Write an enzyme that holds these catalytic residues in place. Structure first.
Site, PDB file in Angstrom:
ATOM      1  CG  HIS A  83       5.150   1.211  -8.969  1.00  0.00           C
ATOM      2  ND1 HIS A  83       5.035   2.097  -9.787  1.00  0.00           N
ATOM      3  CD2 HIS A  83       4.098   1.543  -8.254  1.00  0.00           C
ATOM      4  CE1 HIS A  83       3.502   2.371  -9.969  1.00  0.00           C
ATOM      5  NE2 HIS A  83       2.762   1.677  -8.579  1.00  0.00           N
ATOM      6  CG  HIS A  85       0.896   1.410  -6.157  1.00  0.00           C
ATOM      7  ND1 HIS A  85       0.970   2.596  -6.163  1.00  0.00           N
ATOM      8  CD2 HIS A  85       0.593   1.568  -5.198  1.00  0.00           C
ATOM      9  CE1 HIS A  85       1.229   3.251  -5.006  1.00  0.00           C
ATOM     10  NE2 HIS A  85       0.935   2.287  -4.340  1.00  0.00           N
ATOM     11  CG  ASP A  87      -0.394   1.653 -12.226  1.00  0.00           C
ATOM     12  OD1 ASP A  87       0.405   1.259 -11.261  1.00  0.00           O
ATOM     13  OD2 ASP A  87      -0.739   3.038 -12.690  1.00  0.00           O
ATOM     14  CG  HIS A 148       4.396   6.435  -8.032  1.00  0.00           C
ATOM     15  ND1 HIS A 148       3.572   7.477  -7.752  1.00  0.00           N
ATOM     16  CD2 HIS A 148       4.305   4.974  -8.218  1.00  0.00           C
ATOM     17  CE1 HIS A 148       2.479   6.390  -8.008  1.00  0.00           C
ATOM     18  NE2 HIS A 148       2.943   4.974  -8.273  1.00  0.00           N
ATOM     19  CG  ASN A 179      -3.657   7.676  -5.045  1.00  0.00           C
ATOM     20  OD1 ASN A 179      -2.852   8.056  -3.766  1.00  0.00           O
ATOM     21  ND2 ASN A 179      -4.093   6.604  -5.281  1.00  0.00           N
TER      22      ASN A 179
HETATM   23  O1  LIG Z   1      -2.695   1.468  -8.978  1.00  0.00           O
HETATM   24  C1  LIG Z   1      -2.755   1.763  -8.893  1.00  0.00           C
HETATM   25  N1  LIG Z   1      -2.939   3.359  -9.221  1.00  0.00           N
HETATM   26  C2  LIG Z   1      -2.414   4.598 -10.109  1.00  0.00           C
HETATM   27  C3  LIG Z   1      -3.091   5.643 -11.164  1.00  0.00           C
HETATM   28  C4  LIG Z   1      -3.759   5.235 -11.731  1.00  0.00           C
HETATM   29  C5  LIG Z   1      -4.269   6.636 -12.532  1.00  0.00           C
HETATM   30  C6  LIG Z   1      -4.842   7.566 -11.641  1.00  0.00           C
HETATM   31  C7  LIG Z   1      -5.148   7.101 -10.657  1.00  0.00           C
HETATM   32  C8  LIG Z   1      -3.751   6.464  -9.609  1.00  0.00           C
HETATM   33  O2  LIG Z   1      -3.902   6.047  -8.182  1.00  0.00           O
HETATM   34  P1  LIG Z   1      -0.725   4.158  -9.131  1.00  0.00           P
HETATM   35  O3  LIG Z   1      -0.624   5.792  -8.225  1.00  0.00           O
HETATM   36  O4  LIG Z   1       0.402   3.611  -9.630  1.00  0.00           O
HETATM   37  O5  LIG Z   1      -0.278   5.485 -10.795  1.00  0.00           O
HETATM   38  C9  LIG Z   1      -3.765   1.842  -7.508  1.00  0.00           C
HETATM   39  S1  LIG Z   1      -4.569   0.670  -7.602  1.00  0.00           S
HETATM   40  C10 LIG Z   1      -4.957   1.057  -5.749  1.00  0.00           C
HETATM   41  C11 LIG Z   1      -4.148   1.943  -4.479  1.00  0.00           C
HETATM   42  C12 LIG Z   1      -3.583   2.626  -6.133  1.00  0.00           C
HETATM   43  C13 LIG Z   1      -2.470   4.072  -5.935  1.00  0.00           C
HETATM   44  C14 LIG Z   1      -2.092   4.056  -4.235  1.00  0.00           C
HETATM   45  C15 LIG Z   1      -3.559   3.931  -3.235  1.00  0.00           C
HETATM   46  C16 LIG Z   1      -4.010   2.389  -3.661  1.00  0.00           C
HETATM   47 MG    MG Z   2      10.670  -4.313  -8.471  1.00  0.00          MG
HETATM   48 ZN    ZN Z   3       1.345   3.368  -8.258  1.00  0.00          ZN
HETATM   49 ZN    ZN Z   4       0.675   4.813 -12.527  1.00  0.00          ZN
END
Ligand code: A1H8V
Ligand code: MG
Ligand code: ZN
Ligand code: ZN
Length: 231
Positions: A83, A85, A87, A148, A179
């Site tokens: 996805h 994001h 990570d 998610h 999140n």
């Molecule tokens: O990679 C991200 N979040 C991952 C995450 C991993 C560990 C702890 C918390 C956490 O949110 P995840 O939600 O994809 O698992 C990022 S970076 C900037 C944003 C986000 C999520 C949506 C809002 C803006």
């Molecule tokens: Mg994809």
């Molecule tokens: Zn995510």
């Molecule tokens: Zn994640």
């Protein structure tokens, strides 16, 4: 056996062999004064490797490539991000500079661009409607529906019965929602039921963060999402 946050200094990556030719990669990131682990997947295909997801950031992803070279010694030729994001795509520019062909669905690429995140090069066709599946080398990619995130994919390795859920599937120790800013809470349980229906034979289920388990992670995730829905 499976590595946890305390075993992995930030910036380091561990590999964990799940089955023949199937590994998870485990890294950590600090945010808001806490430390979070994150998983991705590596699947052997002949004499090359398929990577699923970055190691959450440029430095981690460079360390991931160095660890793969040190421990496995086969080239990563393609990578899929499950996805949009950070990570999952944070580290795509590192992969690209290293000569890895990077892939995501067109929905994921669009969302990544809107977010200002790194954007995989190639667009995976055939994943736009809930229930769609496509073969990609040694794996099946499946779009279960919005969960998610609206674009989230899961990955199944048929030879090993390994299901990688990414951030749509929670580890057992997580009993509250993460999140969920971009989540479709209304559709998430239905999307999980599509995963269960398509991969009922899965023997190992890898969440986006934390400890692997079995198919029990799916109903656990539904329970957490419904409880959050009713918050
Ligand atoms: O990679 C991200 N979040 C991952 C995450 C991993 C560990 C702890 C918390 C956490 O949110 P995840 O939600 O994809 O698992 C990022 S970076 C900037 C944003 C986000 C999520 C949506 C809002 C803006
Ligand atoms: Mg994809
Ligand atoms: Zn995510
Ligand atoms: Zn994640």
């Amino acid at each position: 056996e499976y590595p946890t946050v305390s075993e992995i200094p930030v910036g380091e990556v561990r590999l964990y062999q799940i089955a023949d030719g199937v590994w998870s990669h485990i890294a950590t990131q600090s945010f808001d004064g806490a430390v979070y682990p994150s998983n991705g997947l590596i699947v052997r295909d002949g004499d090359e490797l398929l990577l699923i997801d970055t190691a959450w950031g440029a430095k981690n992803t460079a360390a991931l490539l160095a660890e793969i070279e040190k421990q496995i010694g086969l080239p990563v030729t393609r990578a899929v991000s499950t996805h949009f994001h950070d990570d999952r795509v944070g580290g795509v520019d590192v992969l690209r500079a290293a000569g890895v062909a990077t892939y995501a669905s067109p929905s994921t690429r669009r969302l990544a661009e809107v977010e200002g995140n790194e954007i995989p090069t190639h667009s995976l066709e055939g994943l736009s409607s809930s229930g769609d599946a496509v073969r990609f080398g040694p794996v099946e990619l499946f779009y279960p529906g919005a969960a998610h995130s609206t674009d989230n994919l899961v990955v199944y390795v048929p030879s090993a019965s390994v299901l990688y859920g990414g951030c749509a599937i929670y580890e057992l120790s997580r009993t509250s929602a993460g999140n969920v800013a971009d989540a479709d809470l209304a559709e998430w349980p239905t999307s999980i039921e599509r995963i269960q229906q398509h991969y009922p034979e899965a023997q190992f289920v890898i969440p986006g963060h934390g400890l692997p388990g079995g198919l029990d992670l799916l109903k656990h995730t539904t329970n957490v999402v419904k409880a959050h829905t009713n918050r």
